[PDB]
Design a binder for this molecule. Structure first.
Ligand SMILES: [Cl-]
Ligand SMILES: [Cl-]
Ligand SMILES: [Cl-]
Ligand SMILES: [Cl-]
Ligand SMILES: [Cl-]
Ligand SMILES: [Cl-]
Ligand SMILES: [Cl-]
Ligand SMILES: [Cl-]
Ligand SMILES: [Cl-]
Ligand SMILES: [Cl-]
Ligand SMILES: [Cl-]
Ligand SMILES: [Cl-]
Ligand SMILES: [Cl-]
Ligand SMILES: [Cl-]
Ligand SMILES: [Cl-]
Ligand SMILES: [K+]
Ligand SMILES: [K+]
Ligand SMILES: [K+]
Ligand SMILES: [K+]
Ligand SMILES: [K+]
Ligand SMILES: [K+]
Ligand SMILES: [K+]
Ligand SMILES: [K+]
Ligand SMILES: [K+]
Lengths: 456, 456, 456
């Protein structure tokens, strides 16, 4: 596997010097060796002069530094690593910002490095044969950063797993494929258990909304539950709900919901978090316009928009998970294109029926720099999905407050939970980058770690 | 004019009873007179039984009550008022919610009544000949509500004026027409003064962005400044900047920016606020794709989107107002259609480069229930308007984070102010209601009143 | 200015080693210094180890090498040059392909280097302040390459000038601006003379097609002629005709036609070619659908497509240039979007009414690797522009054989010349690269040089 260690000097054959612009001069003294690299944000200079390779990466000035953009900077170094085929790297952070707290910066540096050196060649004939085998984090200060490195490593491992699942094509990534992934993941840890419903079970429960979305398909619906019993027995679990509609459209809406749940379950299992968590996945493949379905809850839904099938899967799943008597429920869905227009790729939009939960997610977002922006769950917009023939419509007649309307639809099914909804259409896919990001795995693991600490 | 008085009993020939559902029974005792009206939110029952007419209007239960929707409820009564031709009305609020603070509820009731009985028949041959001549607010409690009524009245007067200006057609509402409105408004109050630039003056200042938007038109550009010297001489003014691009398109983007500035200037003049305020209006009428302009600031702007001309007018105006050395600058623009998708009609989206200012606007929004939602001014999205041939583009190449991008463009021109930008495309026009609302006049007057009090 | 010299060893402080993969080993012996760079096509490795910087640039294997793509490879080195701020560079070509003839490779290397280090910051506030000041071409063989370097230099100077003109925005690049460029260029060389027609002159000649295209605009039409009298007096000139419709649309059709004429006139003036050449520019700015115009030739043209105005300018200009009694006439026009669909960015599509001329252009294209593909001037497609009300239509009723139809339209005006038409919509702009290329300046200068040699 990947070796992550921490040390107070650099001992590998290649080194990556991460340099704040205000520390450039000091670095120069310790070393126009002087003039050539100015340590500007994202600037990269590989010095192959010594027998050992040295790559300088600039951060610019503290006052211009947006932490949420740090992956984009590390990306620059990661290209050089791949290009020079460097598999073992010492990462010296002594010349970064004095102000920044080292623990989070360590966590982030390790995470971004492992994340940005990710490669997908599963379906290619020519293999890249490149990956990092070792990172030696080099730090001279007095702070304990060992664990931070371990966590950033685990998270990056989960983001990359999420990326794998988002990158698979729909004909390979079938509902059976996903069900098998859940089996293979749960088999690897004694703390895991797997429960799931097939169509028959789902039909006995009256899950009319979710079953209708797959009605026409050859791929079976499944509601898959990975119970991670990290915490004390009987303590209420945190439930993560992911939407995994194969071949979903809004432009294409990928597996990001379930991909991030998988990625998050893997990470917390690796870190062995002392918290109870259930990862739940609603699986289906893509029932005419105007049909009326009966949800498990018993609310009748007129499906006015055939494009909006993803929410139908999420509503029955959200009703079903109530059995867990969850302390919190967070769902993740590449749910609306409106989200990209509202916030772009940088933020996951979030909606919550609980200020306490919203706050915790906001703290996790600040800590991890996996950015969220809360949007208002504005009840009067419920009128936009009144229906002539049914209890409610699934979608408004126009595009206005689209994401809000979608969250409101779901909110009819979650009134008994403390609940948050992350619309990750932008944050998971990009907005024209079109690249799997593995988000919001980092946010969720920070949130879960914070909840796990509150346990002790 | 309109008579607003306050009294502890009802003495006019028609009465409007505003009834919380929890107080229905109590109202019945004081009076199937019983069974017929249930005081549901917005329910209306006119009793023409007595010689005096009595209209009952329900509020539903406290726990279901969204204050920001109160105009929609009052609207129901206002239809009855017009239909029954009632010009003098006693408004009894003793049966409304006990919990609600009476002062704000009084202010809101008076405002909504005057606002919702608004009529526009200026260009019609058949006149409605309807308006409220007198409201007697009836309240039995110990709170002093006289002033609250006066304020709600002034605000509604400003909203209606704003509605008039939004409702005028572009061929009547010329830049000259607007300039004359500013003259007529400033002539009515000793506290007002008028300064303005014509094209020649604007060209001497190098206002290349704003001048370019009107370059082709017969209607002249103007930058119109209404200085309201309510406060102590030499105290830094609050500057309100409005975008008034005649015949603007994004669907059509109306005069809402300048209309709300006008409405706000009228209201604070009527209330005689002890605060220094300058209302500024950038006027122009609708220069090919790809042109490069030099702003007054000297930044060069490639105009990639011919639709996005409104921001060009706002940037030069924002630079120009710096002369005032304003304590705060708030601009208002029906700027993007993206806003309607993000938030719909209920919220003005806001962006701020100052947390202090954002907070004050958030307090005003809470107080008045003229809702705002802060969106993030996310600097990395500046990349979306990098330009090959110029300092910057005016618009991104796609629709993503559109409103944010527009705010970021403007933010390049306001780095020296505490500054907020209200995108009122949704809140001023509706999202398919398509009706002038006079917003955000109510928000701005609350904000200004709060600032005026902090003066003493 | 730029210093270009030739030498048999490298004497500047930075060096660029251009390395064929089959010569990598040999280079290594002369020098894992070994393992790291594999000389793959476009691979770049800057060695800042010595006091002098050394950049290695790979070509891959001879059998995989497409010469027309060489600029894309040089581009890789040019980024490093700019990034390391290297202004003086020795370019060693001894390790390139043995098979390639050195003269053309020298010409191409110099041209691509100067072309790919081009910067446009005319309208920017922040200047790049970067350009090559000196290239020392290093070659150990027995071939005389001095002149080749001079020519490649002149051509790159013309391509960059063309790029400048394509990159200017329409509001800066007015018909007056272009007329002034022709004045400034003709003033710099005794061999140049300037004749031109304004609108009045054009109207006396009956140029009804060209005048109609600008009829509505403020920018005047001009037909601008730069007579370059390099050759013997009285010898028939080669006429290059360029279409320069400001703000033209098809997506946007730029100044590429006149830009390349300008660039070509500059280059041959610098090289002092002993050939008679007239560069002619039809200038206008953007007359309803269905109008009938009388061309100078007297053919009546129904303008069915308002988008197709560019050809109307070209037809009157083509008639007019007959006065020169030209030996050959080549026109260049970003004329159809169809071209990009047919051939993409790599080829200029060409049409000719003369096999002799087509052949010469094909030889120039082979020599310079400024690629052309001849398309058929298929007379039966003349039926697609038959007109009910006029001699002919300007455009077909559908998109089929669009470029061919456009060439056929023009061919009605050139039956007395040996004539070629280059549709450079793809080759000048890119197809989503969207980048000015300065093509086909290189092709035209090779053609002209070849014609100049045939003179002696
Ligand atoms: Cl990994
Ligand atoms: Cl959906
Ligand atoms: Cl939507
Ligand atoms: Cl609850
Ligand atoms: Cl923990
Ligand atoms: Cl009024
Ligand atoms: Cl705009
Ligand atoms: Cl937009
Ligand atoms: Cl400030
Ligand atoms: Cl006050
Ligand atoms: Cl040059
Ligand atoms: Cl054309
Ligand atoms: Cl075509
Ligand atoms: Cl001939
Ligand atoms: Cl020659
Ligand atoms: K297990
Ligand atoms: K199925
Ligand atoms: K949308
Ligand atoms: K006055
Ligand atoms: K004008
Ligand atoms: K939009
Ligand atoms: K001359
Ligand atoms: K003209
Ligand atoms: K086409």
């Amino acid at each position: 596997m990947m070796k992550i260690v921490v040390n107070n000097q650099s001992t590998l054959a290649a080194e990556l010097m991460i340099v704040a612009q205000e520390n450039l001069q000091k670095l120069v003294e310790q070393t126009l060796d002087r003039r050539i690299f100015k340590a500007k944000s994202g600037e990269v200079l590989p010095l192959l002069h010594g027998d050992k390779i040295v790559i300088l990466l600039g951060l610019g000035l503290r006052q211009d530094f947006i932490a949420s953009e740090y992956d984009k900077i590390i990306a620059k170094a990661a290209e050089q690593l791949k290009k020079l085929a460097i598999k073992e790297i010492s990462v010296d952070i002594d010349y970064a910002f004095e102000n920044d707290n080292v623990k989070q910066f360590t966590l982030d540096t390790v995470r971004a490095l492992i994340s940005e050196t990710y490669v997908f060649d599963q379906l290619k004939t020519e293999k890249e044969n490149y990956s990092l085998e070792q990172i030696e984090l080099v730090y001279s200060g007095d702070q304990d950063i060992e664990d931070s490195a371990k966590i950033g490593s685990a998270i990056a491992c989960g983001q990359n797993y999420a990326k794998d699942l988002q990158n698979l094509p729909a004909n390979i990534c079938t509902t059976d494929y996903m069900l098998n992934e859940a089996r293979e993941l749960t088999s690897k840890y004694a703390t895991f258990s797997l429960d799931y419903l097939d169509q028959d079970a789902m039909a006995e429960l009256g899950m009319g909304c979710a079953l209708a979305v797959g009605r026409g398909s050859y791929m079976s619906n499944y509601t898959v539950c990975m119970e991670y019993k990290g915490g004390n027995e009987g303590d209420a679990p945190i439930v993560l709900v992911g939407k995994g509609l194969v071949f979903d459209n809004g432009m294409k809406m990928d597996m990001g919901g379930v991909a991030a749940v998988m990625g998050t379950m893997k990470a917390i299992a690796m870190l062995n978090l002392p918290v109870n968590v259930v990862g739940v996945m609603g699986l289906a493949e893509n029932y005419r316009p105007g049909d009326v379905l009966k949800s498990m809850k018993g609310i009748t839904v007129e499906v006015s928009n055939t494009d909006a099938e993803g929410r139908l899967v999420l509503c029955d799943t959200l009703t079903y998970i109530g059995k867990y008597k969850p302390k919190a429920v967070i769902d993740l869905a590449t749910l609306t294109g409106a989200m990209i227009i509202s916030l772009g790729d940088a933020y996951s939009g979030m909606f919550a029926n609980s200020d306490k939960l919203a706050n915790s997610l906001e703290q996790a977002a600040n800590a991890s720099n996996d950015l969220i922006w809360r949007l208002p769950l504005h009840k009067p917009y419920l009128k936009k999905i009144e229906s002539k023939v049914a209890d409610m419509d699934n979608c408004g007649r126009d595009r206005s407050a689209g994401s809000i309307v979608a969250a409101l639809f779901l909110s009819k099914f979650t009134e008994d939970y403390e609940w948050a909804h992350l619309d990750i259409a932008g944050s998971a896919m990009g907005d024209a980058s079109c690249k799997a990001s593995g988000r919001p795995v980092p946010l969720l693991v920070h949130y879960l770690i914070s909840q796990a600490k509150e346990n002790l």
